[PDB]
Amino acid sequence: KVFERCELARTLKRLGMDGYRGISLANWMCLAKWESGYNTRATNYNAGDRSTDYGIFQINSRYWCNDGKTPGAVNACHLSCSALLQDNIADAVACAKRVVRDPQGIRAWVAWRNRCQNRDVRQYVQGCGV
Ligand X SMILES: CCCO[C@@H]1O[C@@H]([C@H](O)CO)[C@H](O[C@H]2O[C@H](CO)[C@H](O)[C@H](O[C@@H]3O[C@@H]([C@H](O)CO)[C@H](O[C@H]4O[C@H](CO)[C@H](O)[C@H](O)[C@H]4O)[C@H]3O)[C@H]2O)[C@H]1O
Q: Which residues bind Na ion (CB under 5 A)?
A: 127
- Rounded Cα distance between 57 and 73, Å, is 19
- Rounded Cα distance between 56 and 1, Å, is 9
Q: Is 4 a catalytic residue?
A: no
Task: Enumerate residues 43-62 that contact ligand X by CB under 6 A.
Answer: 53, 58-60, 62
SS3 2: strand
Q: Which stretch binds Cl ion (CB under 5 A): 46-54, 62-70, 81-89, 91-99?
A: 81-89
Which residue in the set 11, 39, 43, 86 belongs to the binding site for Cl ion (CB under 5 A)?
86
Which residue in the set 44, 82, 88, 123 belongs to the binding site for Cl ion (CB under 5 A)?
88
| Cβ closest to Na ion, residue 114 vs residue 126 | 126
DSSP string, 13-82: HHTT-TTBTTB-HHHHHHHHHHHHSSBTT-EEEETTTTEEEETTTTEETTTSSB-S-STT---TT-SBGG
Closest approach, Cβ 112 to ligand X, in A, equals 8
Q: Is 53 a catalytic residue?
A: yes
Q: Does 83 bind ligand X (CB under 6 A)?
A: no
> Could you tell me how far CA 16 lies from the centroid of its own chain?
14
Residues that bind ligand X (CB under 6 A): 53, 58-60, 62-64, 74, 76, 99, 102, 108-110
